[PDB]
Amino acid sequence: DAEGYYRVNIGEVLDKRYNVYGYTGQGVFSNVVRARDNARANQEVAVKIIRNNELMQKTGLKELEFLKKLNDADPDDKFHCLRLFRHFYHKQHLCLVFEPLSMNLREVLKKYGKDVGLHIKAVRSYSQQLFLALKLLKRCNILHADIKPDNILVNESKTILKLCDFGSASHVADNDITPYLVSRFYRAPEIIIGKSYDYGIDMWSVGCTLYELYTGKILFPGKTNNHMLKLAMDLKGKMPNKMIRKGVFKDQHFDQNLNFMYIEVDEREKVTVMSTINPTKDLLADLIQRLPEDQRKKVHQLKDLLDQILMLDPAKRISINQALQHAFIQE
Ligand SMILES: NC(=O)c1cc2c(-c3ccc(C(=O)NCc4ccnc(Cl)c4)s3)cccc2s1
Numbered sequence: 270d271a272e273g274y275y276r277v278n279i280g281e282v283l284d285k286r287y288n289v290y291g292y293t294g295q296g297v298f299s300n301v302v303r304a305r306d307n308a309r310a311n312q313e314v315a316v317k318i319i320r321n322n323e324l325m326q327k328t329g330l331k332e333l334e335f336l337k338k339l340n341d342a343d344p345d346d347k348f349h350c351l352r353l354f355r356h357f358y359h360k361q362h363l364c365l366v367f368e369p370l371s372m373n374l375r376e377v378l379k380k381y382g383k384d385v386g387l388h389i390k391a392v393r394s395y396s397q398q399l400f401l402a403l404k405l406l407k408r409c410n411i412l413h414a415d416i417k418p419d420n421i422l423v424n425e426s427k428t429i430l431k432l433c434d435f436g437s438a439s440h441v442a443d444n445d446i447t448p449y450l451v452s453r454f455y456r457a458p459e460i461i462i463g464k465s466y467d468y469g470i471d472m473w474s475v476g477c478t479l480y481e482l483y484t485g486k487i488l489f490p491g492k493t494n495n496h497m498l499k500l501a502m503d504l505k506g507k508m509p510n511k512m513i514r515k516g517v518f519k520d521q522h523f524d525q526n527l528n529f530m531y532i533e534v535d536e537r538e539k540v541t542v543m544s545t546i547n548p549t550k551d552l553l554a555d556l557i558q559r560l561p562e563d564q565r566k567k568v569h570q571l572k573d574l575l576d577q578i579l580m581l582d583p584a585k586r587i588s589i590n591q592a593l594q595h596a597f598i599q600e
Pocket residue numbers: 292293294297301315317351367368369370371372373376422433434
């Protein structure tokens with residue numbers, strides 16, 4: 270209609286084969302529906318209906334290009350990325366046919382309880398699959414730029430995960446200087462300051478997600494870009510002086526003496542000058558309930574893995590291979 274979204278009807282047949290029976294969620298970047306393919310023995314499929322407007326039309330065609338490249342590079346489907354079956358058009362809207370996947374990780378956490386999180390064994394298996402998805406993204410020279418529980422889907426048995434939504438995705442050479450890239454809570458410090466970014470932004474997002482997967486709550490629930498840096502510095506201390514100078518938007522958060530400018534509400538803004546930020550955030554205490562040694566040792570290994578991921582400088586950040594060979598996964 271006026272906004273761009275398609276008015277989906279239950280019982281409607283798309284591309285003379287896809288009989289729509291139910292809705293998945295429908296918010297969203299591009300509305301998704303559940304359908305049965307009558308041309309393929311009524312087998313279940315997920316249809317993503319891309320918005321009619323030119324803003325999302327270019328986004329949909331870009332997503333179609335990225336999904337094709339990632340699927341062709343992974344024929345055996347071992348690098349945990351969403352599989353695109355085919356594409357078609359319906360009433361001016363681009364429609365993408367995908368795997369019949371159950372739900373996203375944000376929906377799984379809601380069913381687990383308020384600040385409960387998943388089991389350490391599931392978090393371990395999910396980590397490896399998330400790192401395997403990062404390996405394929407790096408090989409294809411693609412940045413996801415939106416890794417979060419909402420964009421990670423699971424099968425009915427919840428044993429296999431698949432990374433979805435390649436709408437905000439981009440190529441390495443096609444890098445843009447923007448501090449609003451990646452969903453705020455999963456945004457890497459290099460994006461905020463305006464430093465040259467690469468695959469490390471996807472690694473940072475996985476780290477934020479893995480903490481949320483076990484704790485059931487957001488790691489850095491920052492209201493603004495400035496508050497995001499403060500919460501990140503509450504764990505690993507003050508950002509290195511060499512990193513600050515390399516950033517384009519350094520003046521918005523730091524001064525000439527390389528000191529952080531913390532913005533606080535009340536209602537007018539109050540700037541607090543900080544020469545040094547002492548690490549106050551206890552990542553171990555936040556992770557732990559206190560249960561048996563078999564689980565206790567695994568939680569401590571996740572803490573060490575998170576410390577290696579949550580490094581402010583992307584050059585001093587853990588690699589994909591090291592993350593896969595880490596003690597937390599190898600058990
Ligand atoms: N939003 C997207 O880009 C995509 C979402 C999906 C999905 C789904 C995402 C969310 C789905 C869904 O049904 N969510 C609601 C929900 C909540 C709790 N339990 C169940 Cl069984 C379903 S399906 C499946 C396959 C491909 C794609 S692409």
